């Protein structure tokens, strides 16, 4: 049907809309708590307090919403929405839009360490279903169809990326028809077009042009893939089991979470000032550290800092994402072994080796590898890393299939449906 | 099993080598047919008719070789291996690899309208069979990998394209585990180092950067596409049936057939001197045509010039590939719809509908959408017409549905067979 290719637009145009305001909001709210800061930027321990405090509350009012009204809105939404695929989960929109938007600017405008793609896709996956229910479209066909284009479109506008939302929805979330693929492309083109439309000349990561890899030089991609390859199995289990950990301080009991939740997100308001490069989505961090600003020393303790409160702000069931924080861990240790193999020889430079780092935990991790690989190069716009970038990938991948991990997403998902029959 | 992992990394490899000589083939036999005219650079009907004779009779050769020894080596040979991975097809490397390879310098040295792509995915295909036998790995899954990562590697090596040549046998040819997967990136990763070992720093299309689209520009590209996506499925017929009416012209002998390749080979060569943008791949062509040197006149001659010439050296079952082709048909109408669309106007630049035009066909004829997007980013390297190409792939696309053409190489594959059943 036209229909859904229609309603694929409309979709498309408010997941556009929907995210470009989770935007403009996150970004109003750290203006905000710089102004907090520049009152108080003379009294230092008063300094300190309000950049907490700001964010302990911010944190606390989404943690609030998330463990109040919407559940299912804590953590990426992604095993959500590909739960929803599977039909094994509700899209409770009335419920989730507002709670996640709201509880994402709470957590994502206090500083934690999370990104924007956890509540876009969500989102994104939640307003097709609105759409869907609107139009009371009936079928599998167009329930599947919108909720999948909603997804691509929130990942696509997410990081300005149309091509990595289509790949990732359309091919790395397990085994759609001849329409919903061109569903999901309407549903991307709109929502990019939205985001250029508000966002134009301004990118989420500058790192001009690096030079080539030579041929020489590849070995060392794979072996960098390798490393992510390990780590990333271990690193899944560290959330999967983190998220535990952080539930015998709390067994359940709301006023609990939501004081954990503003320690946590105090924690990462404090650090917002102290220790910049510990805090946030990444985004920041990542061209400062591909540029090669970062003493290796820097290297290993930012790379510490933010593994650390990456699982203390996700593992601790916040609205927000796992997946700029992967790139920022991907660039941080991708750099490190590129000073390393500088060092250690060849025509090298540590940044060609961030670049290959950025995606490869999402290979290692979530197991998508062509959408991290398509998605660096068209954050970047290093055309001319791409074999290095396959290399690292299939290193990565390869590794992370015979160290026995699983896809993060779906592990997150498997739970959630144990628990959901064993209750 | 580690086995395969292995296995791919030796074919890719092989597949590197096989395509790259069938490079240096080529090229060298341009050299002298180049010789064989400034010899005779004075007598203008002497000139001509070498011209003729040398191509006439290297297109013999190459017909003579598929019609006497190897059949299912006429045409593009990825059909064969659509349907050796389907199981409907043997893969008889010990006919097929000799044949298609000296086949193929025949008719592409010559200067017919064939693609490399056409040879290097069969060959590469056939060459993943052959270590199969070699080493008689026993099963369907090495079966199928080695053959799907030969493929991988041929695509990756005729364009350096290895992220085009993982997407289209991955993912665009019909609904792979897990290591077949890896299978195909390690033969793509060994293919495409093997070609960049010998072929580095000289590209195939040169367009430097063009600027971008303005989103209020968009709408058209959109339009390009519904033009392709008409267009594709009415080539595809033509293509259909100049296989007959090419036929009824021989009625299967092979001295007819040999006499009609040379007659079309011979066309192609003396095009090859007068009429240069009529004659070869198109590769050529395509960067003269996107910089716009072409008086709108001198494009529609070279479109009607080459959409003959493309449907007479392909359909009379020639050893070549309808891919390159079916990129310069791309350029050379999007740049037509470029410069119309310049004159009708905004802040355009014909140059931007001719990459966008470029993948069009192999959205709109096979059917392959991405695949034709990720290739002319990788070819072209214009990163910033990104969301063009995915609008332009949508309309190519999605009318070539509605207009109810189908895939060209499978229409090609489900012929073959129906013609292997009533027999
Ligand atoms: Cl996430
Ligand atoms: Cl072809």
Redesign the interface.
Same mark, same amino acid.
């Given at each position: 049907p036209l229909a859904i290719?229609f309603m694929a637009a409309v979709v498309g145009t408010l997941v556009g809309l929907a995210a470009v305001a989770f935007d403009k909001g996150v970004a109003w709210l750290q203006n905000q708590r710089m102004g907090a800061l520049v009152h108080t930027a003379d009294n230092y321990p008063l300094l300190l307090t309000v950049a907490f405090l700001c964010s302990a509350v911010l944190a606390m009012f989404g943690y609030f919403l998330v463990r109040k009204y919407a559940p299912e809105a804590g953590g990426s939404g992604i095993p959500e929405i590909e739960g929803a695929l599977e039909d094994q989960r509700p899209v409770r929109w009335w419920r989730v839009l507002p709670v996640k938007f709201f509880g994402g600017l709470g957590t994502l405008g206090g500083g934690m360490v999370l990104g924007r793609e956890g509540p876009t896709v969500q989102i994104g996956g939640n307003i097709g279903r609105m759409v869907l229910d609107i139009f009371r479209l009936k079928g599998d066909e167009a329930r599947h169809t919108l909720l999948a284009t909603g997804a691509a479109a929130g990942l696509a506008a997410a990081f300005n990326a149309? $091509?990595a939302g289509?790949?990732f929805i359309i +091919?790395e979330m397990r085994?759609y028809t *001849?329409?919903s693929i061109?569903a999901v492309? @309407?549903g991307?083109?709109m929502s990019? @077009?939205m985001y250029? @439309?508000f966002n134009?000349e301004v990118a989420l990561i500058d790192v001009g042009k690096l030079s080539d890899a030579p *041929?020489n030089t *590849?070995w060392l991609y794979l072996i960098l893939g390798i490393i992510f390859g390990i780590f990333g199995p271990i690193f899944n289990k560290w959330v999967l089991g983190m998220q535990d950990l952080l539930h015998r301080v709390h067994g359940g009991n709301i006023t609990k979470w939501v004081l954990m939740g503003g320690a946590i997100g105090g924690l990462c308001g404090l650090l917002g000032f102290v220790a910049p490069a510990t805090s946030g989505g990444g985004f920041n961090l990542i061209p400062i550290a591909t540029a090669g600003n970062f003493s290796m020393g820097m290297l290993v303790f930012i790379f510490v800092a933010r593994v650390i409160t990456t699982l203390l702000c996700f593992s601790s069931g916040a609205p927000g994402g796992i997946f700029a924080p992967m790139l920022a861990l991907g660039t941080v240790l991708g750099t490190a072994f590129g000073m390393v193999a500088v060092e250690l020889f060849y025509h090298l430079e540590a940044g060609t080796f961030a670049i290959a780092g950025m995606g490869a935990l999402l290979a290692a991790s979530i197991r998508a590898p $062509?959408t991290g690989? @398509?998605l660096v $190069?068209?954050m970047t716009?290093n +055309?001319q890393l791409?074999?290095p970038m396959?290399?690292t990938?299939?290193g990565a991948?390869?590794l992370a299939?015979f160290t026995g991990g699983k896809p993060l997403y779906s592990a997150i998902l498997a739970r959630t449906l144990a628990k959901q029959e064993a209750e």
């Open positions: 290719l149309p $091509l289509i790949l +091919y085994p *001849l329409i061109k492309f @309407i991307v083109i990019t @077009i250029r @439309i134009h *041929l *590849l $062509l690989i @398509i $190069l068209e716009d +055309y791409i074999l396959i290399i990938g299939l991948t390869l299939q």
